[PDB]
Amino acid sequence: VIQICSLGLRWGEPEPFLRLALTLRPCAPILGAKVQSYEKEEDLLQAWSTFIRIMDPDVITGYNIQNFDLPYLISRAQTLKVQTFPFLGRVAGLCSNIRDSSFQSKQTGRRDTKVVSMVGRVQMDMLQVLLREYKLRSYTLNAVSFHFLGEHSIITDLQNGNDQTRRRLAVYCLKDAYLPLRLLERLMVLVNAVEMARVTGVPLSYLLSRGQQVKVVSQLLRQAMHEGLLMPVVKSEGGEDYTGATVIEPLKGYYDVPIATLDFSSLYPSIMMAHNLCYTTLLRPGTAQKLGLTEDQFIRTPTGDEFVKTSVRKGLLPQILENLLSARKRAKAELAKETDPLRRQVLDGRQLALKVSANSVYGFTGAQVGKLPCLEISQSVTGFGRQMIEKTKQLVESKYTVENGYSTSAKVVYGDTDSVMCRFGVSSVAEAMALGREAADWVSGHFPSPIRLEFEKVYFPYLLISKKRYAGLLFSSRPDAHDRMDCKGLEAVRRDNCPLVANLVTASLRRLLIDRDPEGAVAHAQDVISDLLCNRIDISQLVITKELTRAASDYAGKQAHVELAERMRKRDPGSAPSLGDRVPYVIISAAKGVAAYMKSEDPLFVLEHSLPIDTQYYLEQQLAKPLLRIFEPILGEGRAEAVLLRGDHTRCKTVLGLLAFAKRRNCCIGCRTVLSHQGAVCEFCQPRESELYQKEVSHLNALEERFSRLWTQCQRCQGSLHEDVICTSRDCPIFYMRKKVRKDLEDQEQLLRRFGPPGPEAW
Amino acid sequence: MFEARLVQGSILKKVLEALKDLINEACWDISSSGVNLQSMDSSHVSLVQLTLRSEGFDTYRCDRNLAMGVNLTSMSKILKCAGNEDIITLRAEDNADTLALVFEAPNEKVSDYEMKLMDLDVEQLGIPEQEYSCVVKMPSGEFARICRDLSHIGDAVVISCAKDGVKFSASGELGNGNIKLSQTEEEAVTIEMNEPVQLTFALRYLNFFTKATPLSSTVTLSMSADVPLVVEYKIADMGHLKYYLAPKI
Amino acid sequence: MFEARLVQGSILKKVLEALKDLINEACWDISSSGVNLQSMDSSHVSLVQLTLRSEGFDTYRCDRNLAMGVNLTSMSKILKCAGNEDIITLRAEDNADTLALVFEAPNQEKVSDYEMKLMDLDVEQLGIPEQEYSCVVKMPSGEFARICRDLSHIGDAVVISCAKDGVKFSASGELGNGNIKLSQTSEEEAVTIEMNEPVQLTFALRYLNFFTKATPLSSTVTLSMSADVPLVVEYKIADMGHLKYYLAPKI
Amino acid sequence: EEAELELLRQFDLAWQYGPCTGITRLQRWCRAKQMGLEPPPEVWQVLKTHPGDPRFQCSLWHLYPL
DNA sequence: TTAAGCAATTCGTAATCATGGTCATAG
DNA sequence: CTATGACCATGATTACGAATTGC
């Protein structure tokens, strides 16, 4: 271990107050930080342990400190025989130890971590907070720093060199150690963790280790001491499933008359609230008998149970849910007065977390592997849901009709278990908004409270492909003209595909829904396919990522990413994907057509070893079928022939051990006839040579302009204008797009030396 | 304007059945000398060299040296619409991006097919004219069988050529085996060993090369230390078809 | 050290083509008497008995009695690398856990040598109760094969009814039912029947169809039935020995 | 050898001779000599007693896709 | 000792089933 | 030297698991 670098601050002050860097050879001074140097590693580990005792911090953060940093330090101190290192905690006579742990759920998957013991102090690895809350494409520090802010063997010779190289290494390490602080204070992590621990009543270490059961157990016990009840222990392996939610059958297609969306807000917690459903008021089938009082003492549910009215008991789950609902309402009332966009979405994150907590209260009941299940309640909930949504659809389509004085009889096109997308008939967004608000407020008056239906949007135009797949354009007000698109479910929000395909789907829906020009859309898709086949598409747009889950399900059937991961490298059998992460790969061309798991390769390996790409795989398996989903419903099946013919005019333009034994046959630039001698033009195509020189110097001119815009961008992203660039960042498009233009220019410069020189040079 | 008349059209059929599975898109260099084609395979592990001399054709004619990137799969499909006895006629227009295939039945029927050409910027390679330590001539059928047999034992074949004879061998899950040929008209095996050689090749590709068996009674194998194996089938008076396979290192 | 030379090697090829689909892994008992193999099928519904007498071989030789657990699938694949005219030579080493198959092409300018890996099989041995049969039917193997293929289109099982005059096979299913009747005649085209007692038994055409892969081994096949016992289907391997298939009936 | 391979690795990272990871080693030695910054006469005397070896006459990172 | 629920759509691999090109031998 | 179906080889259909998103 050669350098340790530390940043420290008091919470509430907008800058740090401590900035220290401890190195292992003599170094050069850095303005703003202290620098100390040692000639042996024992002094370095001792100095860090003494600093961490004396400063005595409350919280320790970092990025991947649990699974890399602390056990490396502990094992390295054990090897070098330094006895006083592993006492990092607060208790004076206690040493620390490495211990494995695993967590698994159907919500976050399964992850295996080490833990290191520190008594008194709290740990917050920001990697685990990101991996638990956020669903992203890559989880590298560079990728999340670009997504939120906007950015090994070389180091061994920056350290065996001079002291300005070591000073450069220390400035790099200090920037690395500074980035997670900025992420912690910018994303409102710690304020939301403190508010979660105050609303639920669990400690601050449980929100990084546990799930959503300890919190609902805690709140139920805290509500149970106030009336004098005790909880039982029921455990069963195992019950059966029950029936979930209804989806209404669509009227599929393309709509160009406005559809208004009406939905219920906080549906399942308000069902559980306003019909008095709880553990503590579930009536067994016999204890009603032989009392006969049915009216206003109990009710009956569509699955079949009987539940006591609120004039006898009050349940415990209504009160816990009412507290959580008021907390989320206060968070939304605070969110309704922000102007900054990233701040608006992080308050949206806070309210999303409180709504997830309130819904996991209901999901506690149906978990037959758990601590206290009561599937009768769950069945009553979803039965009430189904009954109310079909009530909504009957009522909306039945009242506003041609005989009832209105304009047109409306017709529901879609509904998915909480929402209803009714198509009204008018093509004026003001009149649709007015009637939709009247409908929402009208239908809501047929229920107990807090059951309320609300207007939410007007889509104009609309595109419905299947169940859980649609798109549209979003209206919030009228003079607020339009907000954005909505892409529910489609190929632009999933992460199982290429960036090329998601970009093409977004650009096609842009040209098709905003400008309403299908001809520019056809020309766009043609240019994408043509530039694919002509081999001028970057390999950033070709990378596919998949998650490496539990190893036995991936034992059960052969996949591509599992095959790439389990195949080690010759260079490194010590850095490879583990369980739970994401494996990136691209597909190269070969002749083993039975298996697409035999053609997958690491992006850096195909970078350094230059393997070709299977353009037919990407053409017929990645691109073609999402396009045939989207482009068909506006036209007939002559549209499938239109895009497969727009392919056909553009499919006829394709660019191209033994490879060393070349002959390098020259070819005519005009008509492609191989011939003896080095002159560029053919003897039949000579009278046309000024035009053939004119052609292709406007190509060299455009490659020259692309070299310079890229190789000076690295100088501004690096910081310095006087020293070399070293950044092989695999998540930057800049890298390997700066590598191919050198070769394009190398090739296009040599093609023009077929022609003579435009003058002498030795004069 | 190109125009070639080939009476034994079955030759053209056999040729495409020998390239189609190895090559998707190729380029044919037509000229007064005859038709020619050279292309790496998909895998970029081998190189095919086709040579159809104008002499072999019963009527050749090439005004402009015109080459069109042909889709061997489409040309293959098209060529299957020809009887093994029809007279085939290739005919192109220096200005048209389409090649024409006309089949004349011996006896009242004429098929005409216009195949769409395409712009191919194929990666050209140059073969380094070299000498070979060993050249083995043998029935093409025997060679074909050998490659099929071994393919059941393992994925690669070690071709060991010594003074007396040549040996092919492989190994896998179900053990291993080897076939030995020794010197002894188109049923005989001749060997020219200047230097014993030993090289490893993928049976998968050798098996592709063998789709050319119906083109010749015999096939010659030319090897040499650390260089591509040469598998060649003569196309009687027309020219030939050569397959170069990079060895495994 | 085992070593047998078989000039009509196509015989060995035909044998494996008749066992491979019924048996995955078998044991080959070698001795001075000749090669022998007895094994239940996967399904444990039938038993195959192969007998290759040393006399039939053009050069037999067995020093130590051998038991070769062979994977009939690997041996089958390997055997397909033999021409129907090559001279095949089985050769083993009492100490080596590998069997060697050498094929010599008639001309002799080519020799193939295959070393197949053996395996330790603890196969479940069975003993056939030497018994007598009420009915024995001899008939062309091709006719028998066709009968089994035909009925297979009607149903899954075949009822073989043997009476005085002749024998009858029948089946039924979704698309109706049918039956074929064979009667005695008066060499490899005739049908002979030996009925001591009329018999009726039900068998699965699926297995009978496996037995028929042995058709290319003999011009004729004999069927031996008896009340409540396994049907015997036997194909003679001229001067070499034979191949017997026992199928348990359906009750 | 093994002591001559650290002198060149020390000449390659001294900042007072230039920012050199795109060019050869002897070109940077002559560039500094033209401007006469202070090239030392020992990083020359190992680039003369060798032929065209790629581990003497090349910069440290002449691999490495930067 | 540890873990909130169900509905639905998409894609890849192996296995099942249809169909033609050679071929091998009886007429 | 020539019909016939048995044999090998290649392509179309179905089934089921894995992955990921919407409520």
Ligand SMILES: Cc1cn([C@H]2C[C@H](O)[C@@H](COP(=O)(O)OP(=O)(O)OP(=O)(O)O)O2)c(=O)[nH]c1=O
């Ligand atoms: C998202 C989600 C919904 N549901 C159920 C409960 C909800 O009552 C029902 C509706 O889904 P949602 O509309 O997503 O959530 P919501 O209606 O409760 O709150 P809001 O309208 O303010 O966004 O779906 C779950 O059970 N678990 C979940 O994770």
Ligand code: SF4
């Ligand atoms: S390649 Fe250049 S632009 Fe891209 S991340 Fe690295 S330094 Fe920045």
Ligand SMILES: [Zn+2]
């Ligand atoms: Zn020209």
